[PDB]
């Protein structure tokens, strides 16, 4: 188990050292997106929450293909403003309900340290 707490102030520095195997040891769901919303990384805890198979969703677009319930001003709209501005750090509750039992989660979106990548972190509430 990797010990990093959800919501930690310097989480992007800590997660910069992990490969996909290490990300699978986190206590919470983690998705890495490019600035178009394509999925680059998707960990085991996220798949436990959503039912998706991690290897199968890498390369898909999160907003168009995987998670249409997030294509809303309340989720996608926040992401796209962050990508446009080059800064993003926001936490909110949301319900995931596409092809699954409706599940309430806490979401933390934060710009990654390097380049044009963005984290989505998720835990149950
Ligand atoms: C709504 O369509 C949410 C879907 C969803 C959220 C997060 C995931 O990792 C996968 C699907």
From Swiss-Prot:
One of its GO terms (molecular function) is identical protein binding. Keywords: Chromophore, Photoreceptor protein, Receptor, Sensory transduction. GO terms for biological process: phototransduction; regulation of DNA-templated transcription. Residues 23-86 form the PAS domain. The keyword GTP-binding does not apply. Coiled coil: none annotated. The keyword Cytoplasm does not apply. The modification S-(4-hydroxycinnamyl)cysteine is found at residue 69. The 4-hydroxycinnamic acid (p-coumaric acid) chromophore is covalently bound via a thioester linkage. InterPro entries: PAS (IPR000014), PAS-like_dom_sf (IPR035965), PAS_fold (IPR013767), PYP (IPR012130). It comes from the Bacteria. Monomer. Photoactive blue light protein. Probably functions as a photoreceptor for a negative phototaxis response. Belongs to the photoactive yellow protein family. This is Photoactive yellow protein. It comes from Halorhodospira halophila.
């Amino acid at each position: 188990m990797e010990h990093v707490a959800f919501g930690s102030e310097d989480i992007e520095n800590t997660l910069a050292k992990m490969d996909d195997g290490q990300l699978d040891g986190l206590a919470f769901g983690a998705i890495q997106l490019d600035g178009d919303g394509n999925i680059l990384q998707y960990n085991a805890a996220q798949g436990d929450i959503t039912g998706r198979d991690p290897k199968q969703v890498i390369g898909k677009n999160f907003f168009k293909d995987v998670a249409p319930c997030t294509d809303s001003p309340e989720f996608y709209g926040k992401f796209k403003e962050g990508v446009a501005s080059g800064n993003l750090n926001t936490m909110f509750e949301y319900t995931f309900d596409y092809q699954m039992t409706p599940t309430k989660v806490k979401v933390h979106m934060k710009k990654a340290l390097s380049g044009d990548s963005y984290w989505v972190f998720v835990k149950r509430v």
